[PDB]
Structure formats: C-alpha cells, structure tokens
C-alpha cells in the first residue's frame, strides 16, 4: 500500500523564527525549519495529501517579502504557483534539482505527516546523504 503521506490531514506545529537567508541552512545538518510565519498561515488548514501541503508552503513563501527576498525572478515565479524553487547547482543531484521537504522523525517511526515542527527544508544533496543514497 502507498505511504500514509498520501492521506488527508490538518497542519499542526509552531515552526521557528528564521532570517532572510534561511534557505542557506537547507544543505546543513538537519536542513532549515518551517518558518514560524508560514506555520501561522497554515496551522489548522486541511490538506488532501503531503504534496498539497508542499504546494501551500511555497505559495506562502511567495507572499512573504522576507522569505522570498533572495529568490531570483524564475524562482519567485515558481513559488507563486506552488512549485519548489531550484537550489544552487552545487547542491543538486542528478534529476533532483529543487528544495525537498524531509520528515525529521520518519513517518515509519510514527512521525507526523503534517506537523510543521517535524518538517525540514533540505537540498537534494543533503537529503540523499540523510537517507544514505535514497
Ligand atoms: Zn527525509
């Protein structure tokens, strides 16, 4: 059966205060946190799937001047439509070229799918290292 990340749910969690260079943390240790201002927009909203949630995250990033400041024109256009933005080329891996959402406590260990304190923003390079080649 497919992963439970495909089932509907409501967003929970507080997120964390970040600065305008927040995505520079995505390629570090446990990636960057969901910003507290994004969590304040999405908490209690119902989503159809984790991919639906991901789209809402980037849409809210596009509407926050501070969080979207350092995105280039193409990436600003991507996030306004709910698409994940490209990371710097040195943090891409093969066909995986955009920021990825990672569950800190894995869903396989009971981690919650839509808990914004359990979701990190990572680069492809960092995320494939975290899961040892997957
Ligand atoms: Zn992960």
Curated annotation (Swiss-Prot):
Regions of compositional bias (Low complexity) in chain numbering: 68-81
Name of the protein this chain belongs to: Colicin-E9
Domain of life of the organism encoding this protein: Bacteria
Name of the encoding gene: col
Organism annotation: Escherichia coli
Role according to the record: This plasmid-coded bactericidal protein is an endonuclease active on both single- and double-stranded DNA but with undefined specificity. Colicins are polypeptide toxins produced by and active against E.coli and closely related bacteria.
Binding site for Zn(2+): 102, 127, 131
Residues of the full protein shown: 450 to 582 of 582
Biased composition (Basic and acidic residues): 17-28
Family classification: Belongs to the colicin/pyosin nuclease family.
Stretches for region Disordered: 62-94
């Amino acid at each position: 059966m497919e992963s439970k990340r495909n089932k509907p749910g409501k967003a929970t969690g507080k997120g964390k205060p970040v600065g305008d260079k927040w995505l520079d943390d995505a390629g570090k240790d446990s990636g960057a946190p969901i910003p507290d201002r994004i969590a304040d927009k999405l908490r209690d909203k119902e989503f159809k799937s984790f991919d639906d949630f991901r789209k809402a995250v980037w849409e809210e990033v596009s509407k926050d001047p501070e969080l979207s400041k350092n995105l280039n024109p193409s990436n600003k256009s991507s996030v306004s439509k709910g698409y994940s933005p490209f990371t710097p080329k040195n943090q891409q891996v093969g066909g995986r070229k955009v920021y990825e959402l990672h569950h800190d406590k894995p869903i396989s260990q009971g981690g919650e799918v839509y808990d914004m304190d359990n979701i990190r923003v990572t680069t492809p390079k960092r995320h494939i290292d975290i899961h040892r080649g997957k």
